[PDB]
């Protein structure tokens, strides 16, 4: 039984049916494979670590935990307070296994201040005047331990006596927390391998799993990662995840004795034949992704030979994207389109990825996708999957079902993901283009466009000053070059503050108070300066945008105004660490990409909010029928009608403030904001949505504008 | 250039990657096929053997 | 002398970002693993070097700064519920210091 110690990565899925899947889902592909592994990693230990995390240094914690055997056979047996505890040895006389005198017991019953005497001389009694390691040392003995406090570490903690003594001495939730430990044990089995979150002495039969990704920052033991890694490194004990799939373990890639050419290795062949009629007809919060190594090549030489080329690593591209596009390993696909741009699917892979680096080293690169580079790449081949794991998506980058705004530098390929991707399916409702907000919308709203006005003001300056500014921006070494650039910045700032802010502030409901809005902006400042209650995510894409916009020639400005605007926005943007935009894209579109893999049809839902007919008529509306009108705020999808109905009885504590004008422009607002995590993870939401009457034929004439408040209630539909 | 980096105590606690072992061929030069041989099928048959 | 509106002029884009960076750097001198007020040390990714990025532990104080800067950059989110006006409660964010 070789043991592999595991430290979870950045977004390790925890509520998964099997911890094993979040490690690398390829291990579940074959029965012949999954039968070779045990897991352990019990929940009770997890909870203990969650508590002690705030009270021990990494070195101490590692030193304490490292000695614990794999299946913890011991228990911590909490004792009740002496007045309570003493009665137990007489309620059952044979339970007085230490045979404490009856006189002392009833002397304790008589005393106003019952002493620790009942605890005194009891073997392996742990007083509150004890330390964490004291418990751990006894844990290695396997026998149960008697303690006088709940804050203990290393073994499941359960009551020694019936609850009657601890009641009053402890409170409900405290009395509740020990229940699984009161009947804790479960068996551990002797398979070939056993994974574990519990650390251990690294040695000839213990290995550290290396996934090549950042740890879970929230996971309490991530602080141990450096010390563990270096110790493994100095003794060559790291294991790349692929090594686990081989019949015999070895740290290495491309071994002699194995070609590593088997269906098990090919992560692209994601298959789901088995079923259990479980409520998760699908868990749309769990998303399988892969890290892949891809080889890029340019045109061959005059004699058909080709250069060695370069291979890069793409991180955490969702696998269903590739599978649905029938991408296969070992196939040299064409990279460039007719017009020289990238083929769409490659762009999607880049956009939804987290990062792109050179394969060998750990240097991240922003890829160019234009005619800039000489000997440009024309062919691409995916070679192998460095890792393939499922990841939790629920509410990770964005928090509210209402709306979210993503900031990207000018020249990004947002158009591709918002148009080509849904168009590539165009059969299942993904979003409504009327709900997505292009970052350029407000700039286009002014009667002379914001760009035209900026150009018109700008030309008043001397051309040489403008020329000097543009050159300085392009030339990286031109530090500051204050005169030229600052003058332009002043004009930009003055104009934007003057015109853009009031215009932006005049579109408040359009950004947030629709069904569900996805919005783009060139900088967070564009929203903060206008006080728009929408979460803003500072994204970034792993492609060079500057060169990209240098290829777009059909614009108001001759490619020079564009770079000027780009610099201005970047200067305007607040200094902060930006996140990969792919994560947000994964949160939005990811679940939808798994739809075609499903076996059974979907079921629609919604949470319509009522509307009394009185106010409508009072507002001059002509409406048939007495029953209150209702309006669909947001539609959802499930597939197990049973559990879906079972989950529909919850009453959301979020009111809706519906507002609609005479022009039927309808708006919604949730007084308590609706958070995404509140949505059960079996659901599925569209990227964007537009509120609308459930039955437009009920109304016969729109009176004046209307506002009202109502509750929210998930309901079926037909 | 000008990447002024401050000394950090934890940063130096990694250790270099000394143990790198190769089981392949200890070579660094490759023989190549710079100009392929022609496939004759009508005349000059037999002058080449693949 | 007196600042015209110090509450309204202190902000993250210029002021608070500088302070957050200085505080986070100023706390580097100290045990990287030392919880403060129940906030334990954590692992964060360091990307100062484009050629040699990595992750290292940071003390609880720095973790507080990490979140505090995030909050300031996000801006305060207030919710108004004035009683003198009629049925008009709403929420909107601002950079104005409390």
UniProtKB/Swiss-Prot annotation, chain A:
Cellular-component GO terms for this entry: host cell cytoplasm; host cytoskeleton; viral outer capsid
This protein's UniProt keywords: Capsid protein, Host cytoplasm, Host cytoskeleton, Outer capsid protein, Virion
One Gene Ontology term of the molecular function aspect: structural molecule activity
InterPro entries reported for this sequence: Reovirus_Mu2 (IPR012494)
Subcellular location: Virion; Host cytoplasm, Host cytoskeleton
Short name of any one Pfam family annotated for the protein: Reovirus_Mu2
Its job: Minor inner capsid component. Displays NTPase and RNA 5'-triphosphatase (RTPase) activities. May function as a cofactor of polymerase. Associates with microtubules and plays a role in the formation, structural organization and morphology of viral inclusions, where the assembly of cores and the replication of viral RNA occur.
Family in the record: Belongs to the reoviridae microtubule-associated protein family.
Name of this chain's protein: Microtubule-associated protein VP5
Native source organism of the sequence: Aquareovirus C (isolate Golden shiner/USA/GSRV/1977)
Encoding gene per record: S5
From Swiss-Prot, chain B:
Superkingdom of source: Viruses
Intracellular or extracellular location(s): Virion
Stretches of the chain forming a coiled coil according to its record: none
Stated family: Belongs to the turreted BTV-fold inner capsid family.
Task of the protein: Inner capsid protein that self-assembles to form an icosahedral capsid with a T=2 symmetry, which consists of 120 copies of VP2, with channels at each of its five-fold vertices. This capsid constitutes the innermost concentric layer of the viral mature particle.
Quaternary context: Homodecamer; each decamer is made up of two conformers of VP2, called VP2A and VP2B. 12 homodecamers assemble to form an icosahedral capsid. Interacts with VP6.
Protein name: Inner capsid protein VP3
Organism: Aquareovirus C (isolate Golden shiner/USA/GSRV/1977)
Shown part of the complete sequence: 176 to 225 of 1214
Swiss-Prot record, chain C:
Highest taxon above the source species: Viruses
Residues annotated as transmembrane: none
Subcellular location: Virion
Role noted for this protein: RNA-directed RNA polymerase that is involved in transcription and genome replication. Following infection, it catalyzes the synthesis of fully conservative plus strands. After core assembly, which consists in recruitment of one capped plus-strand for each genomic segments and polymerase complexes, the polymerase switches mode and catalyzes the synthesis of complementary minus-strands.
Similarity comment text for this entry: Belongs to the reoviridae RNA-directed RNA polymerase family.
The protein's name: RNA-directed RNA polymerase VP2
Taxonomic source organism: Aquareovirus C (isolate Golden shiner/USA/GSRV/1977)
